[PDB]
Structure 1
Amino acid sequence: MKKRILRVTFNMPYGPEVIREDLDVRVRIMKAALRIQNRATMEIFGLTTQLRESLLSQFTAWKHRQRQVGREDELMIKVSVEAGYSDQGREQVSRVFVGEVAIVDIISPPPDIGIRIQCYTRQIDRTKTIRNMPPANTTFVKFVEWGANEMGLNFICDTSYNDQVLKNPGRSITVASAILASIQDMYMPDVAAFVDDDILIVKDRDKVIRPDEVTNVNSFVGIPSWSEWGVEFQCLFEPSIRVAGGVAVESLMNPSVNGNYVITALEYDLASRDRPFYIKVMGSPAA
């Protein structure tokens, strides 16, 4: 009888602080192929006075250390989420989200004090500015490369628009976050630009990033159905599912929807002491 695994890590100044699965933790994650950054809402129950003092005081949202030696971690702390199963002590954990805390709350009163937390991916860029002059007259791919270097992310770009000359592409960008909006703006809607985990991905709409890593899916909790753009279904926690990856679908109740699809949006509903432990997938026909 396999057990579920859910760890949440915080990179506090003294070191990591990992909330294990033994407590009551609920997490909802939404990811899509857009410029709007990913989000994660976290429910944490049973925190003692010691851990409340240690953690809740560091999501200040004011600024200390006006001299500002360095950047990044001297503004807001980072959170990483990994979920998976465990059988006979043999694990299959996988990472699903990286971000920084933005909003704090208190949800449930005593006797069980619970808090709610909002995290966003690459929110550190909303404060960091641009100190490297954007290219003046260049092609698309070099603009993408400059943006990737400026943000500090490994990038992959594969578009049919890779040999098109742009004039003054980024001469009106004030911070590091509008780079992505610039990249997406030029060639909507065929070109989709998004940031996933730590990788900036720019691609055509209907191209699978990794053609040889197609995950075959044949066991659906949520019956597949046509949904105006392709297919949409639901399953248990499958670590293989990613964004922009491909899926091969074979059904029983709905055998007319079999085919290859490219993943557009995802949703995670993972709990350690509640029923939901799911993944919702929407896809588009492969080109």
Structure 2
Amino acid sequence: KRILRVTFNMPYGPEVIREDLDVRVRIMKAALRIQNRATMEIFGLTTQLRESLLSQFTAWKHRQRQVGREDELMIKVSVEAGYSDQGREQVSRVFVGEVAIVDIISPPPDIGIRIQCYTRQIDRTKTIRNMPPANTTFVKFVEWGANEMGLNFICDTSYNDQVLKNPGRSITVASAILASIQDMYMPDVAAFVDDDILIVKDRDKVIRPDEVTNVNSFVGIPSWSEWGVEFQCLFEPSIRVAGGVAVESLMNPSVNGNYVITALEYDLASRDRPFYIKVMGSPAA
């Protein structure tokens, strides 16, 4: 009994699209600069709901007009998925971001929309309000970037106490901040934004070491990869990105060990078979 909700944020309020409507969310997240994506195929829309949603989702009013100083320029939508049995719920949060693309995939008799949301699509920000530090340490540049983007930060790396001269004075917008933080020191320590938290950590270290996820049931088989172990699983509302995993396989006994998560491929369909999440993991140090 999968329970999947797509919650928009609109001037009227939140209009939650439940799992009764045919919905299909393909989220793909990674420990990269690039904004994590979520494609949303939603069918069964009424005329009123289509008017209330698609008309608000637009790329105008910031190009041929002005109507922009803060948020409400583009609609922010979150995704809450999970399971529910015996009356209890498991609705976690799996994506927060603003819509960028909107098309239609299925014509009548089932008018189904397909939107494309991206995390931190508010690169329509205020062109960097506070100037970046002139000479400062890496953790301090990270703190400035987090404060500029408005997100709380988790910075855990061994490169924090390294000074930089002009760390990002060429930055043009807030989104480019993450690009700069990713650009400097990129063999291991890659920074990203997971939902509302900006994470800057080494690629071989776990963000929350006490939050290891012991994994014993898999769909298919936990197989090797040129980096670590890769495996698909049924939706567990406790697996984030950059988290620690404690794979204990049966089919492949050599893949057992502790791994950190680098990528994540959510594929959630209320009215269809795919309700999986795919994990790319690398050896954890």
User: Taking structure 1 as the reference length, what is the TM-score of the superposition?
Assistant: 0.96
Deviation at 1:106, TM superposition (A): 1.2
1:52-89: CA deviation from partner (whole Å, max 9, x where unpaired): 11111011210169996873333111101000011122
- CA change 1:120–1:20 in 2 (3 A) is same
Whole-Å Cα distance in 1 between the matches of residues 43 and 58 of structure 2? 21
Tell whether the 8 Å contact from 1:6 to 1:20 is kept in structure 2 after alignment: yes
Question: CA–CA distance in 2 between the matches of 1:48 and 1:190?
Answer: 48
Q: How many residues get paired?
A: 285
Give the superposition deviation at 1:257.
Answer: 1.2
Whether the aligned pair in 2 keeps the contact of 1:248 and 1:261 (CA below 8 Å) is yes
Task: Report the alpha carbon displacement of residue 189 of structure 1 after superposing the two structures with TM.
Answer: 1.7
Deviations 1:77-113 (A, max 9, x none): 1101000011122111100000111111111111111
Partner Cα separation in structure 2 for residue 47 and residue 57 of structure 1? 14
1 CA distance for matches of 2:133 and 2:214? 42
| Secondary structure class of the residue paired with 1:50 | helix
- The DSSP-based 3-state class of the residue aligned with 2:9 is strand
Question: What is the match of residue 137 of structure 1?
Answer: 135
1:74–1:242 CA distance, 2 compared to 1 (3 A): closer
> Aligned pair in 2 of structure 1 residues 213, 74: CA closer, same or farther (>3 Å)?
closer
In the alignment, is the contact (CA less than 8 A) between 1:248 and 1:260 conserved in 2? Answer: yes
Task: Name the TM-score, length of structure 2 as normaliser.
Answer: 0.96
Is the contact made by 2:67 and 2:73 (CA closer than 8 Å) also made in structure 1?
no
Distance 1:139 1:27 in 2: 40
In structure 1, distance between residues paired with 2:119 and 2:128: 19
Q: Distance in 1 between matches of 2:262 and 2:33?
A: 13
Is the contact between residue 76 and residue 100 of structure 1 (CA under 8 Å) also seen in structure 2? yes
Instruction: Quote the Cα distance in structure 2 between the aligned partners of 1:133 and 1:13.
Output: 32
Q: Distance in 2 between matches of 1:74 and 1:146?
A: 24
More strand by share: 1
Offset, 1:240: 1.0
CA, structure 1 residues 211+64, in 2 after alignment: closer, same or farther (shift >3 Å)? closer
* Shift in alpha-carbon separation, 1:274–1:48, aligned structure 2, 3 A: same
- Residues 3-60 of structure 1: per-residue CA shift (max 9 Å, x gap): 1100001111111111111110011000000000010000111111111111110112
The 1:231–1:65 alpha-carbon spacing in structure 2 relative to 1, beyond 3 Å, is closer
**CA distance in 1 between partners of 2:137 and 2:269 (Å):** 46
Q: 3-state DSSP class of the match of 1:125?
A: coil
Q: Is the 8 A contact 2:70 2:125 kept in 1?
A: no
Residue 184 of structure 1 aligns with which residue? 182
Tell me if the contact between 1:68 and 1:74 (Cα under 8 Å) persists in the aligned partners. no
Are the aligned partners of 1:125 and 1:151 in contact in 2 as well (CA < 8 Å)? Answer: no
Deviates more, 1:122-131 or 1:34-43: 122-131
Instruction: Tell me the residue number matched to 2:7.
Output: 9
Quote how far apart the aligned CAs of 1:222 are: 2.4
By how many angstroms is 1:252 displaced?
1.2
- Is 1:149 equivalent to 2:147 in the alignment? yes
Change in Cα spacing, 1:69 to 1:213, as seen in structure 2 (3 Å) is same
Tell me the distance in 2 between the aligned counterparts of 1:153 and 1:21.
30
Mapped to 2, the partners of 1:89 and 1:65 lie a distance apart of 48
- Quote the Cα distance in structure 1 between the aligned partners of 2:133 and 2:102: 40
Deviation at 1:125, TM superposition (A): 2.2
8 A contact 1:216–1:248 mirrored in 2:
yes
Distance 1:66 1:48 in 2: 30
Deviation by residue 1:167-223 (Cα, 9 ceiling, x = unmatched): 011111111111111111110121110001001100111111111111100011120
* Alignment partner, residue 220 of structure 1: 218
Superimposed CA distance per residue, residues 117-136 of structure 1 (whole angstroms, 9 cap, x where no aligned partner): 00000111244311211110
Contact kept, 8 Å, 2:3 with 2:82, in 1: the verdict is yes
Aligned to 1:51: 49
CA shift for structure 1 position 256 = 1.4
* Deviations, residues 243-286 of structure 1 (Å, cap 9, x unaligned): 11111111111111111001110000100110000010011111
Q: Which runs of 4+ in 1 moved over 4 A?
A: 64-70
Give unpaired runs (5+ residues) of structure 2.
Answer: none
Alpha-carbon distance in structure 2 between the residues aligned to 1:140 and 1:204: 13
* Separation of aligned partners in 1, 2:136 and 2:248: 45
Bigger shift: residues 242-251 or 126-135 = 126-135
Question: Percent identity at matched positions?
Answer: 100
